[PDB]
Amino acid sequence: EFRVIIPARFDLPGKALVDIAGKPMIQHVYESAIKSGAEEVVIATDDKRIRQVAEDFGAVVCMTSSDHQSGTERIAEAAVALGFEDDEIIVCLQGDEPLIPPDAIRKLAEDLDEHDKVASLCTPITEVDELFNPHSTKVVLNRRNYALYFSHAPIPWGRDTFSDKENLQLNGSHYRHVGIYAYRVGFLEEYLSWDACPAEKMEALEQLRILWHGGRIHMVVAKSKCPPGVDTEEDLERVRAYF
Amino acid sequence: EFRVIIPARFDLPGKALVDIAGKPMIQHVYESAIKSGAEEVVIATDDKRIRQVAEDFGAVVCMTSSDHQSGTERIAEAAVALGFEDDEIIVCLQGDEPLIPPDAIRKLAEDLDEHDKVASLCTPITEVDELFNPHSTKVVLNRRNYALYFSHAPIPWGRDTFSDKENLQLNGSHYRHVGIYAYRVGFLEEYLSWDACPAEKMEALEQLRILWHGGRIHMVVAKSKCPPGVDTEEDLERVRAYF
Ligand code: NI
Ligand code: NI
């Protein structure tokens, strides 16, 4: 009823295989996908070392092309190689997100199925330090929970409050974006025809491409804690300290 | 073919009437509206001192209600009091913008007329200091120049460049929002039925309400220099120094 594809990268050098409490990161990610109730979970990678490690814990791996460098290109190649029909729901779960609640993965799939193109997940920001951290991605929502914008900048900005952080309390006000999407397979062909935009390149946020091209992304707010993922060595030590 | 309404506020105390090179600010604004080729230019205010000064330089003034406190409430009351038909194009020119090129005012009206709800104007940011100044409003555009978001935050954020401002060059990358809109009168009734949203209150940007409610705002990029307007005493001294 839905399938998970996990794009996993090697060049944090050796990222997908960094040890987290005994298991490589990609294994943690894979386990979250299984527990979600996905019909099938597949790891998509262009790296043979990642293939080896994932096959050795029993994962199905789709080897993708060194040409297809973005996560979504990988997903697309894998989705073609695996034979997914245009009506099938794919969850793209980034290999840098090892701590997404499995129920949230499923909820994301349900959201996209409930409504007749792309859904993604976010979580409340309650700590001022996280809001203002340029490493975190913020997302601003409209009334119906569609994304208006995604940024590293602290948005929405408190015109009269951000200059007084000691009195600043965050109360339903701000959301952090999680690296997971739900897409129908059909959408990936249209998506891949679109070129990049300046904002996506500045922010290094590929999802801005969808907004640039007049597309919409529906957001689901995770009920449960969704710890931030792992892109830096600081992130890795934080996540290792959860166990 | 289009009409300008200028909402003008008194409580910068005494804002609309601050002296700029011999004439109150509101007079400068009014003159830009006349030069635009507007069929009619009307000042909307709930303040009798503003009425007096504007009538004494020959302006038509619509006295609005002390209850109707937002600029758009003023515009709406004035638009009703003046008898504007639902198909008529209103340009809302804020009383804090004395240096908008008259050709840009007209271009904004044309934009809205060319396309079958709300248009607004922006101008390129070429100075890093302006981008990063929380007083300035930034706007992010989609491919067809619709606004995705408006903020005081520096957006789009340069993930890998904002930590190296000495090498940062702004090249078609960033836009500053100007306090001017074009609306058909018809839209104002729908607009006024909408309630505020958290983001509009944090940012103090009323235009976020339109985005919140799933509305769109088409942006025109001014060809000519559009100096920032006047909301603070710093702004006033800068603008006085242009003359
Ligand atoms: Ni507070
Ligand atoms: Ni540079």
Task: Please indicate whether, in this complex, the C-beta atoms of B155 and A160 are within 8 angstroms of each other.
Answer: no
Q: How far is residue A194's CA from residue A175's CA, in Å, rounded to a whole number?
A: 27
Contacts of B155 in chain A (CB under 8 A): 149, 151, 153, 155
Task: Please indicate whether, in this complex, the C-beta atoms of A202 and B163 are within 8 angstroms of each other.
Answer: no
Q: Are strands A19-20 and A23-24 parallel, antiparallel or unpaired?
A: antiparallel
Q: Are A151 and B156 in contact (CB under 8 A)?
A: yes
Look at residue A232 and give its three-state secondary structure: coil
Q: What HEC string does chain B produce?
A: CCEEEEECCCCCCCHHHCEECCEEHHHHHHHHHHHCCCCEEEEEECCHHHHHHHHHCCCEEEECCCCCCCHHHHHHHHHHHCCCCCCCEEEEECCCCCCCCHHHHHHHHHHHHHCCCEEEEEEECCCHHHHHCCCCCEEEECCCCEEEEEECCCCCCCCCCCCCHHHCCCCCCCEEEEEEEEEEHHHHHHHHHCCCCHHHHHHCCCCHHHHHCCCCCEEEECCCCCCCCCCCHHHHHHHHCCC
How many other CB atoms are found less than 10 A from the CB of residue A58? 8
How many other CB atoms are found less than 10 A from the CB of residue A173? 18
C-alpha distances in Å from residue B89, one per residue of B85, B107, B118, B138, B210: 9, 12, 10, 25, 18
Q: Where does residue A12 rank: exposed (0-12), middle (13-18), buried (19+ CB within 10 A)?
A: middle
> Which domains can be identified in chain B, with CATH numbers?
1-243 (3.90.550.10)
Six token digits for residue B143: 């491919």
- Closest to B120 measured CA to CA, from B210, B50, B202: B210
C-alpha distances in Å from residue A115, one per residue of A93, A103, A179, A182: 20, 19, 21, 12
Chain B: residues touching A (Cβ < 8 Å): 134, 140, 142-144, 146, 148-149, 151-163, 172-173, 197-199, 202-205, 208, 211-214
C-alpha distances in Å from residue A36, one per residue of A29, A43, A101, A108: 11, 15, 8, 10
The DSSP bridge partners found for residue A227 are none
Cα distance from A212 to chain B (closest Cα, Å)? 4
DSSP string for residues in A97-119: -----HHHHHHHHHHHHH---EE
Cα distance from A165 to chain B (closest Cα, Å)? 14
Give the torsion through C-alpha atoms of A122, A123, A127, A129, to 10 deg: -30
Q: How determined?
A: X-ray
Name residue, tokens 């597309």. Answer: A215
CA angle, A151 as apex, A147 and A155 as ends, to 5°? 80
What's the full length of chain A, in residues? 243
C-alpha distances in Å from residue A217, one per residue of A92, A139, A140, B59, B216: 14, 11, 11, 47, 16
Half-sphere exposure of B63 (CA within 13 A, CB side): 7
CA angle, A42 as apex, A41 and A46 as ends, to 5°? 160
Residue type, A20: I
Q: Name every residue whose Cβ is closer than 8 Å to that of residue B83 and which is 6 or more positions away in sequence.
A: none
Q: Are A173 and A219 in contact (CB under 8 A)?
A: no
Distance from the CA of B169 to the center of ligand 2, in angstroms?
5
Angle between helices B102-114 and B25-35 (to 10 degrees): 50
Distance from the CA of B157 to the center of ligand 2, in angstroms?
14
Task: Please indicate whether, in this complex, the C-beta atoms of A202 and B140 are within 8 angstroms of each other.
Answer: no
Contacts of A140 in chain B (CB under 8 A): 149, 199
Q: How far is residue A197's CA from residue A210's CA, in Å, rounded to a whole number?
A: 10
Task: Please indicate whether, in this complex, the C-beta atoms of A159 and B204 are within 8 angstroms of each other.
Answer: yes
